[model samples]
Target chain A: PVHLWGTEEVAAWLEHLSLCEYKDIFTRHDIRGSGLLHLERRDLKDLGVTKVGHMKRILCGIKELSR
Target chain B: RPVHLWGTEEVAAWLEHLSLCEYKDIFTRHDIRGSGLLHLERRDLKDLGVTKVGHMKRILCGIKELSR
Candidate 1:
């Protein structure tokens, strides 16, 4: 089971990837506040994350935080 | 090339093959228009909340079949 992540935690995680554009993507999805908990892989794709490798990386990050 | 009609009902029906909760999540957000499905990439589906890898593969396959 995956635990939920906080917005700041998600932000930091994305920042660690140097995905600067993801900040705008997060905002576009209204992923501020408690929105991180509801995030799905599909949301990342809509944010222009086309690379499977990148997806895995982010998924790993989320999984790590989920523990 | 087979011409497939892409519309709300078509897309909705196609999506309905998946879990309804997931379908609703995507449908409510994207309002998937006639041409919208064609324009969609994997990323868009992710945004729509299709998180499972298996689900993603199945959905993509279904989209391909629909396009054919």
Candidate 2:
């Protein structure tokens, strides 16, 4: 129940948290993955999610889900 | 090469050569794509070479080889 102000901050926080916790969840599947930089910048772009700032706001929405 | 007890120059030259070997080994360790102060600055370069001109040249040349 933390209030995140904006997208870039949320993105950086999630990336930092994922690095902290990925070994617990993801490594069990034995898949290696990059942190949020890839998702915010790369994967979404490929999916035609082009609006950089808008895409970032959507990313902010996602962090709110787990909080 | 006679053993000259008074020849500090010869001893200094041998130590300088030994230093080049040590510096070369460091570059091999860093896994650099190319060389520069990317990992080390000029002062760090002096530490490995111990204020010797010829040893400095070897480091410069090795950096050149990696760049090319």
Query: For each of the candidates, what fraction of the native contacts does it recover?
Result: 0.00, 0.00
Which segments of candidate 2 are over 4 A away from where they belong? A1-67, B1-19, B22-41
Q: CA lDDT of A14 in candidate 1?
A: 80
Tens-digit lDDT track of model 2 for B1-68: 34222133433343345565444443333211121222334544553343666766655554444335
Judged by whole-model lDDT over C-alpha atoms, candidate 2 comes out at 0.38
- For this target, which candidate reaches the highest lDDT against the unseen true structure? 1
Candidate 2 has which clashing residue pairs, if any?
A: none
**Among all candidates shown, the one with the greatest TM-score:** 1
Query: How do the predictions measure up, each by TM-score?
Result: 0.42, 0.25
Highest DockQ model number: 1
Q: Give the Cα error of residue B26 in candidate 2, in Å.
A: 7.2
The digit string of per-residue lDDT tens for model 1 on A1-67 reads 2233333555665888876557555544434433343346765665567688877776676556645
**Per-model C-alpha lDDT, please?**
0.57, 0.38
